[PDB]
């Protein structure tokens, strides 16, 4: 579990760039800051700051990917079969 | 709207002062990039 701190590659001019899919996340258990990959820029959208995200093992050094945001699967939102509760 | 080419440079007073500085500034140090007899 973690909090979304910032979307580092939001500005990056190049669509679907490896930077665009990186998000800084702070693990709740220990408070250490790390990075997570998002499946695609469209999935980068559902994530916004201060949302709870569940992370799973996966630019080098990024070893995590987001599998849920706000308690719902990112793929479910991407296939758009569910709506993120706020 | 877009331009294909560089705009032609403009010699403003500040450009002259900056250029004229370098021309004067060099001469104190006597650093002239010159051909010399080989």
């Amino acid at each position: 579990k973690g909090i979304v701190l910032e979307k580092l590659g939001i500005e990056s001019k190049q669509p679907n760039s490896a930077i665009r899919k990186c998000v800084r996340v702070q693990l709740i258990k220990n408070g250490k800051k790390v990075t997570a990959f998002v499946p695609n820029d469209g999935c980068l959208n559902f994530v916004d700051e201060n949302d709870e995200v569940l992370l799973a093992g996966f630019i080098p050094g990024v070893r995590f990917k987001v599998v849920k945001v706000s308690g719902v699967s990112l793929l479910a939102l991407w296939k758009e079969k569910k709506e993120k509760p706020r | 709207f877009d331009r294909t080419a560089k705009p032609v440079p403009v010699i403003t007073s500040e450009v002259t002062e900056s250029l004229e500085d370098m021309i004067r500034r060099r001469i104190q140090d006597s650093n002239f990039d010159d051909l010399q007899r080989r």
């Binding site: 990056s12 990186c22 050094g61 | 331009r3 560089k6 705009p7």
Partner: peptide
Amino acid sequence: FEARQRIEEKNKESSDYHAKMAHIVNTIN
């Protein structure tokens, strides 16, 4: 005139973008 002015503007934007990009790639690693 506006041709020269825009050129300075776009150059500054590109430099600022590239300077930022090194920063992000610097922090991430």
